[PDB]
Design a protein around this ligand. Structure first.
Ligand code: HEM
Ligand SMILES: [Mg+2]
Length: 301
């Protein structure tokens, strides 16, 4: 008489991922059976490839989730708004599939299974293949992950709803960034470090009173009466060397509130200042989703 978290929220250090964002083409009913087949497929792939350490998440946008849940729970869920009057664009879709593991080839098979399960009920808008880069660095050359919640106990505390109808569920935020590395390389390394809030090579935190308020850490390391607004990030680099490349940003949280406060800060809605990273990278997509518990996916009928 308890809830089980979907397998893709908590795993740490996964080297590869696939994110599929899609719109519903017909009756929302199509999503009930598809979702049940998909989580079964995941169990099958986990049995066949135990060394892949595979996890996956199926999550739903506001409109379809309100329909599937009958308006019960997910009190904070809403369509992703535009932040900064447009600095952060909004591309709210109906369905998010997140697959992650130690093996991209296994991820690819799972993605094919997801597409076969939902079939022509969905219109795929984005399919992104994330990869961990050398030293877990972002393509900018700065390490990404250092202050991310560590260990299953703390990641559960931050990401997983503890009780009520939504127990075992989580709110998800996805945002694809396009890096202009040519623009970044025009910046001196000291200026880049002041833009992030950490040193580049050694990845040492620069003190809050030594870095600009526009530094990335000053924008997103937020505390309310001394309590940090934590989130569990699953972001990874993506793209080609000669084409579009950047960071696929992905975060899970028991409360959408923590994510939103960080976006209001970054995009200038809180204090009129914006994130210094906007000097070399920009967000081009944006959406909020609700990841139910595994058992609620099994009560989709
Ligand atoms: C281009 C996009 C982004 C890049 C390249 C980026 C890069 C980084 C880097 C290098 C760090 C420092 C290492 C670490 O502690 O993980 C960091 C920290 C962090 N980022 Fe971002 N980030 C991006 C977007 C975002 C967004 C959109 C959010 C939230 C909405 C976010 C939230 C955070 C948080 C919460 C931390 C930890 C801060 C701390 O407590 O020290 N990031 N990011
Ligand atoms: Mg801190």
């Amino acid at each position: 008489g308890m809830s089980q978290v979907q397998s893709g929220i908590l795993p740490e250090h996964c080297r590869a991922a696939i994110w599929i964002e899609a719109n519903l083409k017909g009756d929302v009913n199509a999503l009930r059976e598809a979702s049940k087949i998909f989580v079964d497929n995941v169990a099958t792939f986990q049995a066949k490839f135990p060394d892949a350490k595979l996890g996956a998440v199926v999550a739903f946008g506001n409109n379809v989730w309100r329909q599937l849940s009958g308006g019960e729970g997910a009190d904070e869920l809403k369509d992703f708004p535009v932040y900064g009057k447009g600095l952060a664009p909004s591309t709210q879709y109906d369905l998010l599939i997140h697959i992650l593991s130690a093996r991209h080839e296994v991820n690819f098979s799972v993605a094919q299974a997801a597409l076969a399960a939902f079939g022509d009920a969905i219109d795929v808008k984005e399919e992104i293949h994330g990869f961990r880069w050398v030293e877990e660095r972002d393509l900018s050359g700065f390490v990404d992950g250092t202050e991310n919640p560590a260990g299953e106990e703390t990641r559960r505390e931050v990401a997983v709803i503890k009780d009520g109808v939504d127990a075992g569920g989580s709110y998800v935020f996805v945002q694809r960034w396009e890096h202009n590395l040519k623009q970044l390389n025009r910046m001196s390394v000291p200026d880049q470090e002041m833009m992030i809030g950490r040193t580049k090579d050694a990845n040492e935190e620069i003190d809050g009173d030594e870095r600009p308020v526009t530094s990335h850490l000053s924008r997103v390391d937020l505390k309310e009466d001394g309590k940090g607004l934590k989130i569990v990030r699953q972001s990874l680099p993506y793209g080609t060397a000669s084409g579009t490349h950047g960071l696929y940003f992905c975060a899970y949280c028991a409360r959408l509130y923590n994510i939103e406060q960080q976006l209001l800060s970054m995009f200038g809605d809180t204090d009129g200042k914006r994130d210094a990273m906007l000097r070399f990278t920009k967000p081009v997509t944006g959406g909020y989703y609700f990841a139910p518990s595994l058992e609620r996916i099994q009560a989709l009928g």
